[PDB]
């Protein structure tokens, strides 16, 4: 098995230009906010499985590895909002995250704000990052709760720490609720999936950078004339499912004697990870499924919005 | 009576290839998830009485017998979700299950998440398995609650422990609620009942492996030309009712002098366990009921879905 | 009695060349229509009791037995139009027939067309067959309603599924109503009854194939020099009455000790099934009725048209 | 069989100059209407089976293939009016056609006009095309309903989108009902069938372009001195029946060993598709039928008007 090759095949990262555009903007946000005056407050979108958490873990690596190895400073922070977040609920988890506090046996929402606003200059927080903004909409109706939104405006105007919010593409109507939240968050971006399969894409260079990143030491055989056809036939532009199927083929090749990912084990990888796909999506690998041109069609605009049509 | 023969007739297990396919996939999931990076998160389906609980008890036997006899490690865990599960309700029972905690006199849902995420690396949990996913749909309407779903995504992204969910076939629309839950659960399988009676089935080999597994030391007389006809006439493909009727015949044969299951006591076993069957299902054993070809017809696709049509 | 012999005497089928000509044309229509472009849309005629329903049940046997035993595909469909069919009335019964829908508590005729045109590629309908086209003419006048005709053109041009219409010979003036229906239905055939008695007919071979098909294991005595004379004297060319009288003799022979259909029990069969015949038709079997040559005269052209003269 | 040759023999298109005259006029109508001021509103006629639907599918190919592959724009639209169209009935189907709406559970005819007039600039409709205008006349009487006509004038004057109406030649009296509809539709054309067989016709070049379009790789033998005689004897000028008989011969030649359509299999094609023809039409192919000069007579003016004489 040689589990080093397995973990080294799973932990692989390809920097598409949108990702480095993002990380450049967050360093821009980090040492552009001067902690004297009003911050910049970027907002990042992206659908399910487009690489968001990988982006922020890249960011806390390249921004906080040496400063977390040096001492208890914690300049950048990483937060997910729990579902249907009460303002005291999000505030207390954001508080027990940073520092070494006890911090949550009292739930009073004024005095823990006191403790968090005295601690946010005490350890020297350079940036606060929130992962999951779509948790503030109701399940069965599309009312949105902005107790946490006005609380986040309060902690923004209290201490001038920059905030970078990630979230689903349907989570922006929450920002359409509070207009002061809408104006305070100026930079919204678009981390949409891979666009086309027609040729000379960013998809190409991503694919062959992943190919040299793979643990097989000669060639992976991928990013070819017909392979990206069935690859884009399998995953829409969907980064998580593409990488998942690729990893599930790579483990199958390293289970036995195999020199590269080839045409006997990539099929069984299509057999496993075909579960999340819809019924009208077509299964292209086993016996005779040639792929029409309409099925490599680019992803629509409401690609991170199908959590929202039904209600 | 000789109760050893009774318990040894009840506890009998036949490994059909779908079961070993499952258990191979869960060892694949166990030492494929590296506990560094993102897990694999299999999902298992199956209707009522298709052998699910027997599969997981086989699994905790073959995976945790020696490690539970060695010390307090508890690498694999077994959980059922209680009905209409609150997120704190499922979390506290999942917490009192593992370790030796007190764990449930406080119901605060942030600090018990704290305790569970510090304990899930402390004892070294290799796998968490949930039995009953269909308990998250409402009785009278088909609203589904995904407080527990977003909480399970939270505990998935917090600590990278693999999760194997079992459940009813109509319970997958719950996974259709949250698209991030849908994408995070890639491997969905199909544990459907026995398909046909026409000949050269998996049903055959299952039947005669059960026949050699029976406590009668010469031959059970089953898996014959006409016996599987009335067997598939009694149980649809339904593993629980087939095994139940077989056990109820075996006890009747060992109650008195009988050398094998035969044509006087298998009838009284059809007399007892005919209660759960529908009205239009035909009762084939007593006096003259010859079985038409249409009544050995394979089970439909909505065979684990008749909890769902009426509302 | 031995009811196997009774059902095996009733369910007997003789393939005259017009029937196999038909079934060849409907397989021609099935895999000639490519479901990309414009279909072929055969029309079949035939008077009362000429074997139409038996032909289509033969067809769904030989075309859909294995595919209906395999799963829920339903490639070929079987429809009768109810009398004075409203377009929503025919559409809703054609809808509840295929698939497993609820489908008829709403009667809106635009949204059920929506459901039927999304379902006709969803299950993969290869062919739609309609039995009763003569139900679209008014009783007391010969106005014909073509709401259903233009609706059938609409569903024909919407999805390109081939349609095979059966019906009475006077039902073709309905197709003379809409000229686009007239041009879209190109292949009209003629399933007329048996032509003559005079010798070397198709009637001969049909008769002795029925004779070997009968449950009597030596000879039926039929298709002889004088027996087909009184047979064609009884039934005009009328398949239903000929087969009905033959079956009513065969049951009378198997009621008691009889070795073949003979000249004591075939008479009582003429006594029973002489009711539907006209007054000027002559009753030839009992005491002395020798049959003239003019009474074996071939059937006229308006043999499926006597529902139409009076108004 | 080689189904590629079958579909490639069915999908063949010959551009007679009237068709390219039409398509030139609809591009003229598309980018002559400026969407600022009053549109041009062409009207197209033609009898049954003269190639209308093929013309518009050619048009949406050559006008909307790349723009439908690019994104959700849908510049040109394709509509058939259902039979006896209510204004809300035609409006709701024209609405669910374009865009991705729900659109038809409310039938209120003022608010769906609101939605359609805000959506017709939202997606950027360049052209609306209606197939079936003859559905607005009553069956049994020649009253015509112009609720849909005044509604179409309303949507024409509301947003200035050009409209191209196809329809039967007897459907123009509907346009004679509303004089404002009559004046708003200026360009009416004449897509009549093929005129003569006497020599040097457009029929000639059409016939040999179809001959080189056929799947037989040497010569089809057609468009000769005597073959177009019996061809025009079979089909009047009728494009659908001519192409249908030609296709039914081509399949018969490719069923067995045959090198071209010849004089044994073209006859059986005349045997099949002779059903839609009238009684006084003469059947010319089998044994000795030489064709008089009067039977190649040009089609009359009321050739798309025989749906209209009887009432
Ligand atoms: N740049 C990249 N190069 C290689 N693999 C990547 C890259 N980005 C993402 N992936 C893969 O995609 C998978 C999904 O990552 P991630 O969870 O960050 O997406 P996401 O949009 O955050 O999904 P979710 O929002 O549901 O958490 C990861 O397992 C990772 O291996
Ligand atoms: N492989 C097998 N060999 C022999 N017997 C089996 C096998 N699988 C299941 N059974 C029998 O079927 C019965 C039902 O088992 P089980 O409860 O696991 O099914 P289930 O689908 O989990 O039902 P439920 O979901 O309602 O608990 C058991 O009593 C067991 O004896
Ligand atoms: N080929 C055949 N061989 C033997 N019997 C036949 C054959 N065709 C028809 N019959 C007999 O004729 C009887 C009438 O059949 P059927 O109802 O199909 O005729 P039909 O024209 O459809 O009458 P209707 O239109 O009134 O239903 C059947 O009971 C059947 O037994
Ligand atoms: N230019 C052409 N070249 C070759 N074949 C053609 C051409 N035009 C039409 N056809 C053939 O004629 C047949 C009838 O086409 P179409 O339905 O468009 O006529 P139509 O007048 O629209 O009939 P309807 O109005 O009843 O739909 C088609 O199957 C097509 O194959």
Q: Which ligand is nearest to the CA of C193?
A: 3
Using CA atoms, how far residue D81 sits from A78, B245, C88, C153, D26, in Å, is 58, 61, 16, 12, 20
Tell me the residue length of chain B.
311
From the list A293, A294, A300, the residue facing D72 with the nearest CB is A300
Q: Which ligand is nearest to the CA of B213?
A: 2
Using CA atoms, how far residue C138 sits from A79, A207, D120, in Å, is 75, 69, 44
- Residue C132's closest CA among C57, C188, C61, C48? C48
Tell me the two tokens of residue B42.
């299999």
- The answer to whether D110 contacts chain A (CB < 8 Å) is no
Q: Distance, CA B247 to ligand 2 centroid (Å)?
A: 13
Asked if the Cβ–Cβ distance from D80 to C157 is below 8 Å, we say yes
Residue nearest to atom 12 of ligand 3 (CA): C240
- The answer to whether A299 contacts chain D (CB < 8 Å) is no
Tell me the two tokens of residue C150.
């233009």
Asked if the Cβ–Cβ distance from A10 to B34 is below 8 Å, we say yes
Asked if the Cβ–Cβ distance from B154 to A96 is below 8 Å, we say no
d(Cα B155, Cα B95) in Å, to the nearest integer? 12
Q: Distance, CA A131 to ligand 1 centroid (Å)?
A: 13
Task: Give me the residues paired with residue A137 across strands.
Answer: A144
Tell me the two tokens of residue C225.
């020099």
* D interface test, pick of C21, C29, C150 with most D CB neighbours within 10 Å: C150
Q: Which residue of A has its CA nearest to D72?
A: A300
Q: Which ligand is nearest to the CA of C243?
A: 3
Residue partners of C34: CB distance under 8 A and separation at least 6: C160, D3, D6, D7, D10
Q: Which residue of A has its CA nearest to D66?
A: A294
Pairing state of beta strands C163-165 and A76-79? unpaired
d(Cα D120, Cα A266) in Å, to the nearest integer? 46
- The answer to whether C71 contacts chain B (CB < 8 Å) is yes
Using CA atoms, how far residue D41 sits from A297, C102, D80, D93, D164, in Å, is 33, 43, 17, 21, 6
The approach used to solve this structure was cryo-EM
d(Cα B26, Cα A41) in Å, to the nearest integer? 44
Q: List own/partner pairs for C60-66 with CB under 8 A and 24 or more apart.
A: C62/C23, C63/C27, C63/C30, C63/C127
Cα-only R_g, chain D: 22
Chain D residues with CB under 8 Å of A301 CB are: 72
d(Cα A277, Cα A265) in Å, to the nearest integer? 20
- The answer to whether B260 contacts chain A (CB < 8 Å) is no
Size of interface B-C (CB pairs under 8 A): 8
Chain D residues with CB under 8 Å of A297 CB are: 69
Asked if the Cβ–Cβ distance from B187 to A307 is below 8 Å, we say no
- The answer to whether B298 contacts chain C (CB < 8 Å) is yes
A83 to chain B, closest Cα gap in Å: 6
HSE toward the beta carbon, residue D2, CA cutoff 13 A: 9
Map residue A147 onto helix, strand or coil.
helix
Atom of ligand 3 nearest to the CA of C168: 25
d(Cα D163, Cα D156) in Å, to the nearest integer? 8
d(Cα B229, Cα A281) in Å, to the nearest integer? 39
Pairing state of beta strands D76-79 and C163-165? unpaired
Asked if the Cβ–Cβ distance from D71 to A293 is below 8 Å, we say no
Tell me the two tokens of residue D175.
């346009």
What resolution in angstrom units was achieved for this structure? 3.9
- The answer to whether C72 contacts chain B (CB < 8 Å) is yes
Tell me the two tokens of residue C72.
């829920």
Contact (CB, 8 A) for B258 and B265: yes
In short, whether B220's Cβ falls inside 6 Å of ligand 2 is no
Cα-only R_g, chain C: 22
d(Cα C270, Cα B109) in Å, to the nearest integer? 88
Contact (CB, 8 A) for B62 and B112: no
Please give the angle made by the CA atoms of C297, C300 and C303, to the nearest 5 degrees. Answer: 125
**Pseudo-torsion of CA C146, C152, C157, C158, nearest 10°?**
120
Contact (CB, 8 A) for C282 and C233: yes
CATH of the domain spanning A17-191: 3.40.50.300
Using CA atoms, how far residue C134 sits from C80, C81, C137, C172, C175, in Å, is 10, 9, 6, 8, 10
- The answer to whether B180 contacts chain A (CB < 8 Å) is yes
Q: How far is the first Cα of chain D from the last one, in angstroms, to the nearest whole number?
A: 48
Residue with tokens 């009576």: B1
Using CA atoms, how far residue C263 sits from C209, C217, C221, in Å, is 21, 18, 10
Q: How many CB atoms lie within 10 A of CB C238?
A: 22
Q: Which chains touch A (3 or more CB pairs under 8 A)?
A: B, D
Asked if the Cβ–Cβ distance from C100 to B302 is below 8 Å, we say yes
Asked if the Cβ–Cβ distance from A105 to B111 is below 8 Å, we say yes
What is the DSSP code string of C281-295? S---SSSS----GGG
Q: Which residues of chain C from 188 to 227 reach within 8 Å of chain B, CB to CB?
A: none
The H-or-E segment that residue C3 falls in is helix C3-10
Contact (CB, 8 A) for C137 and C107: no
**Torsion sign (Cα): D93, D94, D95, D96:** positive
Backbone torsions φ then ψ of B78, nearest 5 degrees: -135, 120
Residue partners of D283: CB distance under 8 A and separation at least 6: D270, D274, D277, D289
Tell me the two tokens of residue B10.
């009840």
Map residue D290 onto helix, strand or coil.
coil
Residue partners of D46: CB distance under 8 A and separation at least 6: D52, D166, D168, D169, D191, D192, D304
Q: Which chains touch B (3 or more CB pairs under 8 A)?
A: A, C
D123 to chain A, closest Cα gap in Å: 13
- Residue A161's closest CA among A44, A42, A46? A42
Residue partners of B120: CB distance under 8 A and separation at least 6: B98, B159, B161
Contact (CB, 8 A) for B169 and B48: no
Tell me the two tokens of residue C228.
């087909």
d(Cα D94, Cα C209) in Å, to the nearest integer? 58
Backbone torsions φ then ψ of A219, nearest 5 degrees: -175, 145
- The answer to whether C145 contacts chain D (CB < 8 Å) is yes
In short, whether A39's Cβ falls inside 6 Å of ligand 1 is no
Q: What is the DSSP letter of D170?
A: G
What is the DSSP code string of D190-219? --------SSS-HHHHHHHHHHHHSS-SS-
d(Cα A161, Cα A139) in Å, to the nearest integer? 31
Q: Distance, CA D53 to ligand 4 centroid (Å)?
A: 6
Q: Which ligand is nearest to the CA of B184?
A: 1
Asked if the Cβ–Cβ distance from A241 to B183 is below 8 Å, we say yes
The H-or-E segment that residue B127 falls in is strand B127-130
Which of B243, B245, B273, B306 to mutate for ligand 2's pocket (most ligand atoms within 8 Å of CB)? B243
Residue partners of C276: CB distance under 8 A and separation at least 6: C241
- Residue D230's closest CA among D297, D294, D303, D296? D296
Q: What is the DSSP letter of C78?
A: E
Tell me the two tokens of residue A182.
């809408």
In short, whether A215's Cβ falls inside 6 Å of ligand 1 is no
In short, whether B159's Cβ falls inside 6 Å of ligand 2 is no
Asked if the Cβ–Cβ distance from D69 to A294 is below 8 Å, we say yes
A97 to chain B, closest Cα gap in Å: 11
Q: Which ligand is nearest to the CA of C250?
A: 3
Q: Which chains touch D (3 or more CB pairs under 8 A)?
A: A, C
Atom of ligand 2 nearest to the CA of B50: 21
- Residue D163's closest CA among D215, D202, D126? D126
Residue partners of A99: CB distance under 8 A and separation at least 6: A72, A74, A119, A122, A123
C161 to chain B, closest Cα gap in Å: 26
From the list A7, A241, A244, the residue facing B36 with the nearest CB is A7
Please give the angle made by the CA atoms of A187, A188 and A191, to the nearest 5 degrees. Answer: 135
Q: Which residue of B has its CA nearest to A245?
A: B186
d(Cα D195, Cα D201) in Å, to the nearest integer? 8
Tell me the two tokens of residue A74.
């914690």
């Amino acid at each position: 098995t040689r589990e080093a090759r397995i973990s080294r095949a799973k932990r692989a990262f390809v920097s598409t230009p949108s990702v480095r555009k993002i990380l450049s903007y967050m360093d821009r946000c980090r040492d552009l906010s001067d902690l004297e005056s009003e911050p910049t407050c970027m907002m990042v979108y992206g659908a399910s499985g487009v690489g968001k958490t990988t982006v922020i873990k890249k960011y806390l690596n390249q921004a906080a590895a040496a400063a977390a190895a040096g001492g208890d400073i914690i300049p950048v922070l990483h937060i997910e909002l729990p579902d249907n977040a009460k303002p005291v609920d999000a505030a207390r988890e954001l508080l027990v995250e940073m520092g070494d506090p006890l911090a949550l046996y009292e739930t009073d929402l004024a005095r823990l704000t006191k403790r968090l606003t005295e601690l946010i200059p005490a350890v020297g927080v350079k940036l606060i990052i929130i992962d999951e903004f779509q948790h503030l909409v109701e399940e069965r109706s599309n009312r949105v709760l902005t107790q946490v939104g006005n609380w986040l405006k309060m902690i923004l105007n209290k201490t001038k720490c920059p905030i970078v919010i990630f979230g689903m593409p349907y989570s922006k109507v929450v920002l359409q609720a509070n207009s002061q939240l809408h104006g305070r968050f100026s930079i919204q971006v678009e981390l949409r999936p891979f666009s086309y399969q027609g040729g000379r894409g960013v998809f190409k260079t991503f694919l062959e950078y992943l190919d040299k990143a793979l643990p097989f030491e000669k060639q992976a055989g991928l990013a070819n004339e017909s392979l990206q056809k069935k690859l884009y036939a399998f995953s829409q532009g969907n980064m998580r499912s593409l990488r998942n199927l690729i990893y599930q083929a790579s483990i199958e090749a390293i289970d036995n004697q195999h020199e590269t990912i080839t045409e006997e084990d990539f099929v069984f990888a299509s057999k496993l990870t075909s579960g999340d796909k819809p019924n009208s999506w077509k299964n292209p690998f086993e016996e005779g499924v040639e792929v029409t041109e309409d099925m490599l069609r680019p992803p629509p605009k409401d690609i991170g919005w199908e959590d929202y049509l039904r209600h």
